[PDB]
Amino acid sequence: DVYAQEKQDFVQHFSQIVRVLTEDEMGHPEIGDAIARLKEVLEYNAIGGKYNRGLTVVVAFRELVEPRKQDADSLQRAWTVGWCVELLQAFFLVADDIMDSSLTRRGQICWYQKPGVGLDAINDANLLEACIYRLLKLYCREQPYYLNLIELFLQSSYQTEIGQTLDLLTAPQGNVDLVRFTEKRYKSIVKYKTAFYSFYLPIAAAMYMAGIDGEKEHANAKKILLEMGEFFQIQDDYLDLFGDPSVTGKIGTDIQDNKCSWLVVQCLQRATPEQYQILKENYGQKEAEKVARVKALYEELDLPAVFLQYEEDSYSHIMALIEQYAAPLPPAVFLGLARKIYKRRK
Amino acid sequence: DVYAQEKQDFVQHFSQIVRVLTEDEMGHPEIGDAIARLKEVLEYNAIGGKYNRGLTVVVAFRELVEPRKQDADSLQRAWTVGWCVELLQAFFLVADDIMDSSLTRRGQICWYQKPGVGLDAINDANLLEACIYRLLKLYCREQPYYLNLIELFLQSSYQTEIGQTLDLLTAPQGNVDLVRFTEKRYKSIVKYKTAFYSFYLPIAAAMYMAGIDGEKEHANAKKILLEMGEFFQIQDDYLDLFGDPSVTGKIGTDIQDNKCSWLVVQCLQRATPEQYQILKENYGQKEAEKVARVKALYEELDLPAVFLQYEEDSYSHIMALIEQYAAPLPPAVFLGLARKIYKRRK
Numbered sequence: 051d052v053y054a055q056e057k058q059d060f061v062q063h064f065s066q067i068v069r070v071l072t073e074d075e076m077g078h079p080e081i082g083d084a085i086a087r088l089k090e091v092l093e094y095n096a097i098g099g100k101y102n103r104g105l106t107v108v109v110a111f112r113e114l115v116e117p118r119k120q121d122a123d124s125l126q127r128a129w130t131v132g133w134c135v136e137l138l139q140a141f142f143l144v145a146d147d148i149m150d151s152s153l154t155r156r157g158q159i160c161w162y163q164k165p166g167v168g169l170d171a172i173n174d175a176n177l178l179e180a181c182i183y184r185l186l187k188l189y190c191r192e193q194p195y196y197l198n199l200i201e202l203f204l205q206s207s208y209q210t211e212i213g214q215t216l217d218l219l220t221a222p223q224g225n226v227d228l229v230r231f232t233e234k235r236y237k238s239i240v241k242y243k244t245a246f247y248s249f250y251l252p253i254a255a256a257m258y259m260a261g262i263d264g265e266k267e268h269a270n271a272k273k274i275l276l277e278m279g280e281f282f283q284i285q286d287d288y289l290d291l292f293g294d295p296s297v298t299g300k301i302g303t304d305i306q307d308n309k310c311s312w313l314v315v316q317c318l319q320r321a322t323p324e325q326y327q328i329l330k331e332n333y334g335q336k337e338a339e340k341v342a343r344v345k346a347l348y349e350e351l352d353l354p355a356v357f358l359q360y361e362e363d364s365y366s367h368i369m370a371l372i373e374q375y376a377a378p379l380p381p382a383v384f385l386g387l388a389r390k391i392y393k394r395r396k
Numbered sequence: 397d398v399y400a401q402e403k404q405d406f407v408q409h410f411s412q413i414v415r416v417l418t419e420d421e422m423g424h425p426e427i428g429d430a431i432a433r434l435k436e437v438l439e440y441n442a443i444g445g446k447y448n449r450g451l452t453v454v455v456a457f458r459e460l461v462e463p464r465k466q467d468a469d470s471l472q473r474a475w476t477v478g479w480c481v482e483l484l485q486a487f488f489l490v491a492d493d494i495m496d497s498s499l500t501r502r503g504q505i506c507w508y509q510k511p512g513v514g515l516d517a518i519n520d521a522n523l524l525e526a527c528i529y530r531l532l533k534l535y536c537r538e539q540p541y542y543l544n545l546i547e548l549f550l551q552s553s554y555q556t557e558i559g560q561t562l563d564l565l566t567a568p569q570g571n572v573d574l575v576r577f578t579e580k581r582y583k584s585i586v587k588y589k590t591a592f593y594s595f596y597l598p599i600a601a602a603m604y605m606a607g608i609d610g611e612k613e614h615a616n617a618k619k620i621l622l623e624m625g626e627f628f629q630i631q632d633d634y635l636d637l638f639g640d641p642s643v644t645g646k647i648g649t650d651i652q653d654n655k656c657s658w659l660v661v662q663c664l665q666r667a668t669p670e671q672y673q674i675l676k677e678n679y680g681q682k683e684a685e686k687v688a689r690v691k692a693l694y695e696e697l698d699l700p701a702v703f704l705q706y707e708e709d710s711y712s713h714i715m716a717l718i719e720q721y722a723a724p725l726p727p728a729v730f731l732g733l734a735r736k737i738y739k740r741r742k
């Protein structure tokens with residue numbers, strides 16, 4: 051609703067993002083070809099998703115500043131920082147697609163699987179990360195929140211990299227240990243790898259933009275948002291296997307790449323001993339034969355019904371946390387973001 | 397001399413760097429394995445080189461602050477920022493070794509070629525980059541230069557990524573165009589990919605640490621240091637082919653990876669037309685047979701004698717630039733860094 055009306059405005063602002071990033075080194079014409087490559091990197095990897103995270107920055111911002119303080123410049127900043135969050139996303143996704151050996155993202159081939167790119171994508175990603183800070187300096191250099199935003203984006207990146215490290219250490223290629231795949235470990239992975247940057251970051255960004263910068267307001271926002279981000283990742287794990295790749299826009303890899311997916315942890319909690327072994331023999335391997343066997347087992351234990359149950363209970367809990375911890379923020383802030391991830395299928 | 401006496405102190409401070417980076421998330425014990433991996437990432441990829449860049453921060457700092465203002469805390473900061481520069485280096489090298497398909501660095505196997513790492517190295521690198529800003533916040537958060545340093549490290553990274561993009565666009569795998577490989581293009585590549593982060597960054601860091609933060613002092617320092625960094629990269633290109641991999645610590649790749657090396661640009665300036673074709677047919681290809689042919693041609697045109705000539709003339713020019721542009725800084729700042737790269741063989 052609030053997200054859906056703002057989408058178009060938000061996407062239209064991308065042209066200016068590109069312009070500003072591609073122009074103020076063109077009285078450096080010697081780098082001209084690099085800057086053309088940047089343009090192309092941005093167009094391929096910032097565009098095509100739902101924009102929930104960047105929209106969250108613009109929406110929350112609208113809802114937390116008095117309209118008499120929403121001058122045009124201030125809006126311009128709000129959706130720039132919006133776009134900075136989308137660039138962080140793009141950054142991590144381009145890298146994650148290489149490290150997960152994935153094939154599609156957003157219903158096209160992964161950047162690194164393009165003829166002519168491959169592992170050059172690595173530097174492409176680092177550039178996307180640099181652009182965040184280019185924009186902040188351009189649009190927010192003279193705001194009193196400038197340094198708060200810089201430190202927030204850096205800390206959210208560190209946290210997601212710590213989470214990525216955990217994600218990959220728990221999933222060595224060619225090493226089935228199923229013993230690694232616990233609830234403690236899962237909860238911990240998803241907190242760091244998804245929950246800070248996809249839920250805390252954008253809302254916290256708009257908080258500092260509206261001058262709301264006390265530790266306790268942030269901590270309380272955080273309690274809500276880390277839990278929403280956990281749920282979001284479990285959805286992601288479910289959709290990796292049971293989703294339509296024409297709706298998700300991406301082909302699943304989690305069983306192949308030996309991942310601590312939510313599904314495998316649930317599986318392990320339910321599995322008879324004979325089931326344990328079918329999973330042991332078939333998991334973390336690239337053979338389609340063997341992946342299909344894992345899925346059939348998951349289906350055998352009604353884990354799609356267990357997902358649909360978990361979704362229901364988690365949503366109630368998130369809502370309790372909003373009742374508890376939203377004040378003095380408008381609940382609409384959290385509710386609107388919850389409604390936009392409830393029962394999502396991309 | 398000044399570098400050589402400070403090395404030991406500087407290296408000894410690494411233990412504390414690691415300690416500080418591995419401890420203040422251990423009342424977050426859930427990430428404990430990620431933090432162990434960080435430790436290991438740091439030990440493998442920050443240690444084993446010459447430390448010229450980090451030593452440059454400590455040396456310049458000593459030479460620009462009055463001793464009565466070199467309290468123990470201030471030194472501690474100076475070699476922390478020293479180590480931040482070495483981490484930026486580590487960051488780029490781990491990524492560069494993957495994108496250049498290299499085999500050895502610092503006389504051991506490239507991190508990504510370790511059994512158990514490969515392309516996980518990508519996130520390993522991003523973590524090294526995050527640590528820079530972790531340390532800055534730890535040690536320099538309350539200094540008036542804090543934000544100058546943050547912006548300098550970010551801008552130097554953007555610039556080196558722009559340079560990397562140029563480096564790889566000029567060297568597509570399986571596309572010999574020799575026409576791309578000009579002086580304009582080379583000079584431009586090396587400015588961005590090496591010269592900002594290896595020469596400007598460390599000295600500029602110590603300038604802002606000593607309260608010397610005017611545009612014109614920086615611009616003048618920069619004129620000297622961009623030119624030293626150009627020379628340094630040409631050395632690097634020469635050593636890639638004509639150096640001892642037991643002294644350099646790394647096996648060359650530039651002809652294989654189709655690079656705009658200084659040698660190939662020189663070659664092209666000298667080559668008869670029949671020579672042009674031997675180069676055309678043999679360059680940018682992985683066959684040892686064909687690489688040897690390129691080297692023999694370079695040798696045929698006395699390019700090691702042309703290198704040794706260029707080294708001589710460039711050094712005179714750098715020294716002229718110091719005579720011109722050092723003031724009011726002590727010339728020792730520039731001289732000491734020049735002496736430590738003159739006629740280097742690693």
Ligand SMILES: CC(C)C1=CC2=CC(=O)[C@H]3C(C)(C)CCC[C@]3(C)C2=C(O)C1=O
Nearest residue numbers: 098099100101102103104136139156396
């Ligand atoms: C960039 C913005 C549109 C945006 C795009 C998203 C695209 C994706 O492919 C989504 C998944 C693949 C389902 C992974 C989680 C959600 C993703 C990452 C997604 C965003 O969160 C997002 O803000």
Ligand SMILES: CC(C)C1=CC2=CC(=O)[C@H]3C(C)(C)CCC[C@]3(C)C2=C(O)C1=O
Nearest residue numbers: 444445446447448449450482485502742
């Ligand atoms: C980390 C610090 C010791 C340091 C190490 C270096 C190690 C290298 O391998 C050097 C080359 C491979 C010759 C590439 C240029 C110089 C290198 C990068 C180098 C440093 O500059 C450096 O500060």
Ligand SMILES: O=P(O)(O)C(O)(Cn1ccnc1)P(=O)(O)O
Nearest residue numbers: 142143146147150243244286290
């Ligand atoms: O499953 P992942 O964590 O790789 C993923 O959700 C991306 N991601 C990466 C870090 N946090 C989320 P995607 O499924 O989009 O590939």
Ligand SMILES: O=P(O)(O)C(O)(Cn1ccnc1)P(=O)(O)O
Nearest residue numbers: 488489492493496589590632636
């Ligand atoms: O030759 P490159 O630029 O790849 C190199 O010098 C590293 N580098 C990367 C950017 N600047 C310098 P190395 O020869 O160490 O591999």
Ligand SMILES: [Mg+2]
Nearest residue numbers: 146149150217
């Ligand atoms: Mg992943």
Ligand SMILES: [Mg+2]
Nearest residue numbers: 146147150152
């Ligand atoms: Mg993935």
Ligand SMILES: [Mg+2]
Nearest residue numbers: 286287290304
């Ligand atoms: Mg997934």
Ligand SMILES: [Mg+2]
Nearest residue numbers: 492495496563
């Ligand atoms: Mg390179």
Ligand SMILES: [Mg+2]
Nearest residue numbers: 492493496498
């Ligand atoms: Mg290299």
Ligand SMILES: [Mg+2]
Nearest residue numbers: 632633636650
């Ligand atoms: Mg080289």
